[PDB]
Design a protein around this ligand. Sequence first.
Ligand SMILES: Cc1cc2nc3c(=O)[nH]c(=O)nc-3n(C[C@H](O)[C@H](O)[C@H](O)COP(=O)(O)O)c2cc1C
Length: 353
Amino acid sequence: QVDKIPLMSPCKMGKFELCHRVVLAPLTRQRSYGYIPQPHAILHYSQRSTNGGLLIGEATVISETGIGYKDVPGIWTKEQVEAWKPIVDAVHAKGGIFFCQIWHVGRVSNKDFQPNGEDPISCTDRGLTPQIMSNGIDIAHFTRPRRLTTDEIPQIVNEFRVAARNAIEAGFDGVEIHGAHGYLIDQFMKDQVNDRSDKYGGSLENRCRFALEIVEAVANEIGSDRVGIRISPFAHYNEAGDTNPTALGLYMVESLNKYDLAYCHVVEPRTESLVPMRKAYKGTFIVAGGYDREDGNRALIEDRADLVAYGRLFISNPDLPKRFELNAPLNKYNRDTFYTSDPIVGYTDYPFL
Ligand SMILES: Cc1cc2nc3c(=O)[nH]c(=O)nc-3n(C[C@H](O)[C@H](O)[C@H](O)COP(=O)(O)O)c2cc1C
């Protein structure tokens, strides 16, 4: 038959027994009209579910103030919680383990997305400069955010708490805290953004307090063994760079050891390495960013991660695990339909072997 490979090796993560190490990375596909999950997602996540395979759903918005893009799903209303259920059940029907990624864009937004035209919230009052959207035809503008006050922050921390609870109500096996790519949590961590003079700014310790308070609220709420967190210390997305990525990364992983989480998901830098973080972190380490079958196997073998998440390739190959397991050809992915809004085209029309 076929020789076993590292990527197909079983794994015990948190309270779960995974059958392989190919993880579906969190992917924003903007096909959730009205911020409500849709029927087509049922088929999407179902095509990608395998027994004991881990799936991390697209970034899900925690509150009205956390919206920065059209058609991204939310999880703060009963209507949204009910819409997720059939999707969750379809993943479970094939034996997959599903984590809901909870998110808040912070300053990466515009007043037109905000309730009452309010300004976006962030750790700073500095806004982003315009960016070109995915289609290379439209320019995205951002409103300057308002700098949250010290005693207002705990309420925001609470929003992640409720979201986490709601995901559990929807049936998710757990939640991944979105602490990467320049969004609210990352905005607080990165020194090029956090210009605060209170206990949530300045030192590396204060800048991580927000994220850590969030990890604490969520773990207490749903149990730490049902909680993961994603970070990208080295990423510069949305003008969120840090002058010492390595220490920032080491600080976070070391600080996360006391929480007994289900896992730490770190994004590879696009020198800088995740090795140190992997070494300092005592739990399950998930890595992502530019992997293929070869690099995946090598990362597992060289002890660089316990799980490897795939994004783009999982978009175009519904059966990525199977293809790696047979070292079969892979469908090419079309970035033109990554963020387009059709219910089928570029979302579920990618073929199986
Ligand atoms: C279309 C698209 C949407 C994404 N959406 C998210 C998201 O919602 N949350 C997140 O944390 N990362 C998101 N990412 C980043 C990916 O999860 C992952 O880190 C990235 O795909 C790196 O791996 P790859 O080389 O296998 O594509 C997205 C990437 C792409 C291409």
